[PDB]
Amino acid sequence: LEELELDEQQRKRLEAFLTQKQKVGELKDDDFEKISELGAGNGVVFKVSHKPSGLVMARKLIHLEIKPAIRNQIIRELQVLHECNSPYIVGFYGAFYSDGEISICMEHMDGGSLDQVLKKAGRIPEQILGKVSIAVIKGLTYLREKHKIMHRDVKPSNILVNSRGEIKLCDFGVSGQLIDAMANAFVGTRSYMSPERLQGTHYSVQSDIWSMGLSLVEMAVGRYPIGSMAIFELLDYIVNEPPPKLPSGVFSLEFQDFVNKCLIKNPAERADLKQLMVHAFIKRSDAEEVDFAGWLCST
Amino acid sequence: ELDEQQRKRLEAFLTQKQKVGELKDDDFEKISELGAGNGGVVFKVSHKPSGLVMARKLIHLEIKPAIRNQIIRELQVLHECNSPYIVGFYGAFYSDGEISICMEHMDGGSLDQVLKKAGRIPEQILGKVSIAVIKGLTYLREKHKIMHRDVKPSNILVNSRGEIKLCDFGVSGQLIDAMANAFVGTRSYMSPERLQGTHYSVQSDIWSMGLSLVEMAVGRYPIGSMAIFELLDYIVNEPPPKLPSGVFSLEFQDFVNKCLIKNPAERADLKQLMVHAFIKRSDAEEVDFAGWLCSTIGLN
Amino acid sequence: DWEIPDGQITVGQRIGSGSFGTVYKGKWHGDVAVKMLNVTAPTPQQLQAFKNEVGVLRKTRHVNILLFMGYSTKPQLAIVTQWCEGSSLYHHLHIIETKFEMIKLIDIARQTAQGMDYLHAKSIIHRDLKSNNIFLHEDLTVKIGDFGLATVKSRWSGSHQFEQLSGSILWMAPEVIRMQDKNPYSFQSDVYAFGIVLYELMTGQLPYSNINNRDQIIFMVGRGYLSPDLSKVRSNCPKAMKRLMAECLKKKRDERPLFPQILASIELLARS
Amino acid sequence: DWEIPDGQITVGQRITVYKGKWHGDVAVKMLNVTAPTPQQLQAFKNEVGVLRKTRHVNILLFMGYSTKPQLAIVTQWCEGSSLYHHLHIIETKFEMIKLIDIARQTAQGMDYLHAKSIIHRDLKSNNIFLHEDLTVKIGDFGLATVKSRWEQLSGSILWMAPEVIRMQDKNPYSFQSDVYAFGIVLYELMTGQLPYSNINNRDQIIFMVGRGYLSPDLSKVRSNCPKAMKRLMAECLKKKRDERPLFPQILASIELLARSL
Numbered sequence A: 001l002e003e004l005e006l007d008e009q010q011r012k013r014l015e016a017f018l019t020q021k022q023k024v025g026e027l028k029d030d031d032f033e034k035i036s037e038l039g040a041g042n043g044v045v046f047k048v049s050h051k052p053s054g055l056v057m058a059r060k061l062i063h064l065e066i067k068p069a070i071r072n073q074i075i076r077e078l079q080v081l082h083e084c085n086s087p088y089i090v091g092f093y094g095a096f097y098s099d100g101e102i103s104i105c106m107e108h109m110d111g112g113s114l115d116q117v118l119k120k121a122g123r124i125p126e127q128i129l130g131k132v133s134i135a136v137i138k139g140l141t142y143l144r145e146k147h148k149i150m151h152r153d154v155k156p157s158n159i160l161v162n163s164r165g166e167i168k169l170c171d172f173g174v175s176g177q178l179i180d181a182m183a184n185a186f187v188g189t190r191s192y193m194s195p196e197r198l199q200g201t202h203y204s205v206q207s208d209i210w211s212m213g214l215s216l217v218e219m220a221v222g223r224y225p226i227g228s229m230a231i232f233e234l235l236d237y238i239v240n241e242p243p244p245k246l247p248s249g250v251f252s253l254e255f256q257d258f259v260n261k262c263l264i265k266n267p268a269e270r271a272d273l274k275q276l277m278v279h280a281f282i283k284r285s286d287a288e289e290v291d292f293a294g295w296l297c298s299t
Numbered sequence B: 001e002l003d004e005q006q007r008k009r010l011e012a013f014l015t016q017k018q019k020v021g022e023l024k025d026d027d028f029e030k031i032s033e034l035g036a037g038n039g040g041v042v043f044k045v046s047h048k049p050s051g052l053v054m055a056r057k058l059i060h061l062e063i064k065p066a067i068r069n070q071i072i073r074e075l076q077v078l079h080e081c082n083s084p085y086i087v088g089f090y091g092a093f094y095s096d097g098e099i100s101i102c103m104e105h106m107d108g109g110s111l112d113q114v115l116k117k118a119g120r121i122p123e124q125i126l127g128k129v130s131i132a133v134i135k136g137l138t139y140l141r142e143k144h145k146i147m148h149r150d151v152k153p154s155n156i157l158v159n160s161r162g163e164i165k166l167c168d169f170g171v172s173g174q175l176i177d178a179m180a181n182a183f184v185g186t187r188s189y190m191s192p193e194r195l196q197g198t199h200y201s202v203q204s205d206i207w208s209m210g211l212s213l214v215e216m217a218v219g220r221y222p223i224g225s226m227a228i229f230e231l232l233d234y235i236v237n238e239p240p241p242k243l244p245s246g247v248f249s250l251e252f253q254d255f256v257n258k259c260l261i262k263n264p265a266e267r268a269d270l271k272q273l274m275v276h277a278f279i280k281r282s283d284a285e286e287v288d289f290a291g292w293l294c295s296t297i298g299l300n
Numbered sequence C: 001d002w003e004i005p006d007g008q009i010t011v012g013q014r015i016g017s018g019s020f021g022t023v024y025k026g027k028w029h030g031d032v033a034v035k036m037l038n039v040t041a042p043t044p045q046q047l048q049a050f051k052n053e054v055g056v057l058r059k060t061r062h063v064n065i066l067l068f069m070g071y072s073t074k075p076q077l078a079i080v081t082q083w084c085e086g087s088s089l090y091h092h093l094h095i096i097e098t099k100f101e102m103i104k105l106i107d108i109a110r111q112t113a114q115g116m117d118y119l120h121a122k123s124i125i126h127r128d129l130k131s132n133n134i135f136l137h138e139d140l141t142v143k144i145g146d147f148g149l150a151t152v153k154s155r156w157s158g159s160h161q162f163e164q165l166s167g168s169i170l171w172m173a174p175e176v177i178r179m180q181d182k183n184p185y186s187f188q189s190d191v192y193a194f195g196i197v198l199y200e201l202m203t204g205q206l207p208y209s210n211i212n213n214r215d216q217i218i219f220m221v222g223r224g225y226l227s228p229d230l231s232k233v234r235s236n237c238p239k240a241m242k243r244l245m246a247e248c249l250k251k252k253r254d255e256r257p258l259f260p261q262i263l264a265s266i267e268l269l270a271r272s
Numbered sequence D: 001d002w003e004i005p006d007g008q009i010t011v012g013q014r015i016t017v018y019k020g021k022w023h024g025d026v027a028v029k030m031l032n033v034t035a036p037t038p039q040q041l042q043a044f045k046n047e048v049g050v051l052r053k054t055r056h057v058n059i060l061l062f063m064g065y066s067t068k069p070q071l072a073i074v075t076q077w078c079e080g081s082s083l084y085h086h087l088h089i090i091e092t093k094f095e096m097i098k099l100i101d102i103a104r105q106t107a108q109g110m111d112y113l114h115a116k117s118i119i120h121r122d123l124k125s126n127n128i129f130l131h132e133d134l135t136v137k138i139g140d141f142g143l144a145t146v147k148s149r150w151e152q153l154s155g156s157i158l159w160m161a162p163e164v165i166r167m168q169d170k171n172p173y174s175f176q177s178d179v180y181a182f183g184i185v186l187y188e189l190m191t192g193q194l195p196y197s198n199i200n201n202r203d204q205i206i207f208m209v210g211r212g213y214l215s216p217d218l219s220k221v222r223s224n225c226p227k228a229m230k231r232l233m234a235e236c237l238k239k240k241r242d243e244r245p246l247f248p249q250i251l252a253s254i255e256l257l258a259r260s261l
């Protein structure tokens, strides 16, 4: 509950977002104009301009061949995002369908994804990842406490940042129908899936913690930790081999222990959201003073 | 009018035909190729149920089964076409996209084939041919009110006995219609009135006989290497051919001239030709055509 | 390449006859049509016609051209194409007398024109277009077939021509009948044959059905004294189709329209 | 020979594939990239070279290619919908005789491809068009190769043989992996469903299918499915590729099955 609290500036930023959002109504393709291309995934995301409101927005197009009934139910389930308001969760504006593609409109993050920052830094400093760890843990706790869902797709490409210093989660499993629909395509080249989910055993938000740990190891060493191999070899490596570890020299002992407790392959012994928040690595970085904006702007 | 031998041969042929029943494809065995026309090869075959040696012609047509059945029935009139100057008919049937017409085998072949070995055919021989064709046409006209429609050297057949018989005439009205759109040839003996679409009659068969007689007399197709249209244009536009001089009697030259008059109204008819001086002389002539033929083509 | 080893093709029931050879239903990776030269001593023309048809067919990839699939040299020369279950347009119009609706009659003309346009764009002149060589398949998909006589840039069987072969008289333009020009064939003579096909579609009948004299048809059509009786066209035939048919049947080849224009006219009246 | 000049093809509505006009309706599959990479021209040359070897009614008819303006492949325009659309979007109620005939025609086209030594490598219901609701057309030869005497995972995981997913053998793709993809098509036809419909995790499907832990639930096969068809489908889906039959034998099994109805 203490992680769910916001400072004065975060409360002002959230209300300012919800105020600008209040000017938006029903979304339609005719009411949008493209600005630039924010990147691409397995799906394309455009920086767009909503003409009736004038707001800058991010529009993701998901190409699916699904029954219209399934398409409409996805739009209905995505409406839950209107109640997912947090300084660590990307704001949501609307969703609609046109030309065989489902549009998801959300808040724009000028900094981009933490996977694109890795390419513009090589490695990410430990105190920066401490703020990221705090943002991810708080965001995962918010989804579990307020909406009873997990993220199920934590990875550096789904942790977004901006010049205002904010670090928010995105692309989480808010729609049961959208999860099912996207399971048969969107083949990736790497993976952050927990070992227990890969094997079809019982899973929970612990899998998001494992995914966060692997993302932190990548952003710390500057390389994907699993194992060039194809996807199945990588998945097999995740199941069979012991987890990766952070180098012993540069990184602090607490940060190594933080990552190690995230990456325990047995999810029953893996640390949880509560234990991680009261971990020594979080408290040191929580009370610490870092200008993440300046580091993000330079990198 | 029939002689005693002519009456006998026809009776012996009708008795041979009593041995023949319904014709079927499996009841035939090939022997040799008799020759080839624009419709394909005519085959000399054997009808096992009767044993008789026949000539089998295959006519490939794509037509309605109902029209195919009417063609077979119209061809049955041939059983009532009995004459010493008419090739005999045995039967007809349909088998694998073609209508097979089985007929009397003529071991001397067609005069078209004979002309190739003979080079030319002497006048007295052609007098017996003229009588055979005129008596065949007159028989068809008076007994069945049908023209021949396709008189030419290849449709006048002969045998080692010295007989001269007409074949391939227009007995089945639907077969005439069915064969009009194909079976194109490289020469033509068609009368000028029929080419031009005007009124015609058995006069046209007389034109075709006169043209065939000139060809066999001089050993050359007398129309006009021209393709088929240019030959048809020549028949319509140019005056008819004539026999050369110093070779044939004036009666023969006058006979073919009156056959080849391009106006069918003035062209001689079967009755006028039958009392022409050429036919009168030829009928009373003793001509060993059987011996001439066998010696000319090499028959035994 | 496209040569099929002997033994893989299973020859079945006889289906009909082509301009050169006999056509059978067969089996080779499914149903096929197999056109074989069942002749012990084939003529030079029959040999060159097989070589020509394979050469022309290999240049064609279009839904309205019969699909060439392969050929065999031994034990006999054979051309393998797709099998068309609906037989030929001649069979439908003049054998079983299928009563096509006008929309389907127009669409058959449209697909035929579509295939002819494709051929002429590749400088292929069919020279034997007739309803027997228009095969049907699926829901009346038209397939133009039989390329024994076809020329490509006026060549035949991989060589310049030393003769001018000819097909069936009924679909034959007057200048092809007369054989007075050195080369009497052109895109426009194919158009004339298409016009006769249009006449079959809109009358249900072959032309000159009252004239049973082959040599009479040759002379009078060649002289321009005989032409199809356009009053036999059914009353449900659109006026624009009768006008187009009349232009395709013009006696002077220079007055006939070409297939790009023919297609535009059929697509316009089909919209009405 | 099959290159189409620049100003002949008319491009129309986008369906990537556009509906176009070149001597009638055609489908035009283009590469919108202004600068084709070597891997792009490689794939384009490979696909055209493979398509030009195909002349069969159950193979999408290749008609030509254009290199200007953009790299484009021209094929016939198919009327109707794909088998994936029929089975999983509009739920067309095919009778069993038609389901078997769709399987037969698909096997017919694949048998042709394998006789031309062509491995399709992307067989799936989305690439099987039911032209005029009657004739199977196998399309999308973007991954097709010609097997000769002499890499990242690419394709749709539902139709991938376990050895294709694993990408560990020297030649993961073979005629037998095309057979496995065909076996999944048989599963779609005889169940009306995609496999692993209860599994909503793509990486779980990859790991478990490649390890042989997960395979299609053959109990979803409808009761009207003949016994010889479920048995043929199970033999096409064998985890070990050497136990799968080849398409000459698959065709004969379907044909005998079709007579026994």
Ligand SMILES: CNS(=O)(=O)Nc1nccc(Cc2c(C)c3ccc(Oc4ncccc4F)cc3oc2=O)c1F
Pocket (backbone or CB within 6 Å): A060, A078, A081, A089, A090, A091, A092, A093, A104, A105, A106, A107, A151, A152, A153, A169, A170, A171, A172, A173, A174, A175, A176, A178, A179, A180, A182, A183, D200, D201, D202, D203
């Ligand atoms: C890989 N792991 S997995 O196999 O579990 N697959 C899946 N994982 C997770 C989710 C899904 C489906 C899905 C997706 C992808 C999705 C994307 C964007 C989205 O918009 C916003 N998002 C956050 C904040 C604001 C927004 F506007 C909502 C979404 O909601 C969804 O449900 C999966 F398929």
Ligand SMILES: CNS(=O)(=O)Nc1nccc(Cc2c(C)c3ccc(Oc4ncccc4F)cc3oc2=O)c1F
Pocket (backbone or CB within 6 Å): B078, B086, B087, B088, B089, B090, B101, B102, B103, B104, B148, B149, B150, B166, B167, B168, B169, B170, B171, B172, B173, B175, B176, B177, B179, B180, C212, C213, C214, C215
């Ligand atoms: C060029 N002139 S034309 O344009 O009029 N064409 C036509 N001319 C004349 C006739 C026909 C059709 C036809 C034919 C061809 C035919 C052939 C053989 C036949 O067997 C026997 N024949 C006589 C005696 C014994 C037989 F066994 C009967 C036939 O019966 C026929 O009716 C034509 F098409």
Ligand SMILES: Nc1ncnc2c1ncn2[C@@H]1O[C@H](COP(=O)(O)OP(=O)(O)NP(=O)(O)O)[C@@H](O)[C@H]1O
Pocket (backbone or CB within 6 Å): A038, A039, A040, A041, A042, A043, A044, A045, A058, A090, A106, A107, A108, A109, A110, A112, A113, A115, A116, A157, A158, A160, A170, A171, A188
């Ligand atoms: N709201 C946003 N604001 C700014 N950039 C964004 C936003 N959403 C997405 N992006 C960018 O768009 C890129 C594409 O995202 P996406 O289509 O989700 O693929 P991905 O997450 O990067 N990798 P994958 O999930 O395997 O397809 C991301 O990497 C971000 O850089």
Ligand SMILES: Nc1ncnc2c1ncn2[C@@H]1O[C@H](COP(=O)(O)OP(=O)(O)NP(=O)(O)O)[C@@H](O)[C@H]1O
Pocket (backbone or CB within 6 Å): B034, B035, B036, B037, B038, B039, B040, B041, B042, B055, B057, B087, B103, B104, B105, B106, B107, B109, B110, B113, B154, B155, B157, B167, B168, B185
């Ligand atoms: N009954 C028969 N006996 C012997 N030979 C015959 C008989 N009938 C036909 N022939 C021969 O078979 C060959 C083909 O005859 P046919 O098919 O009628 O064509 P044609 O009259 O010779 N020329 P055409 O009419 O222009 O096609 C000719 O050489 C005839 O001499």
Ligand SMILES: Nc1ncnc2c1ncn2[C@@H]1O[C@H](COP(=O)(O)OP(=O)(O)NP(=O)(O)O)[C@@H](O)[C@H]1O
Pocket (backbone or CB within 6 Å): D015, D016, D017, D027, D060, D075, D076, D077, D078, D079, D082, D126, D139, D140
């Ligand atoms: N030859 C064709 N005729 C008709 N429709 C076709 C043809 N080829 C492809 N299509 C359709 O056009 C679309 C293009 O599909 P595809 O070939 O896979 O390329 P795509 O742009 O990636 N679309 P997708 O199927 O989602 O991958 C699909 O809806 C196909 O069903």
Ligand SMILES: [Mg+2]
Pocket (backbone or CB within 6 Å): A041, A157, A158, A170, A171
């Ligand atoms: Mg993402």
Ligand SMILES: [Mg+2]
Pocket (backbone or CB within 6 Å): B037, B154, B155, B168
């Ligand atoms: Mg004859």
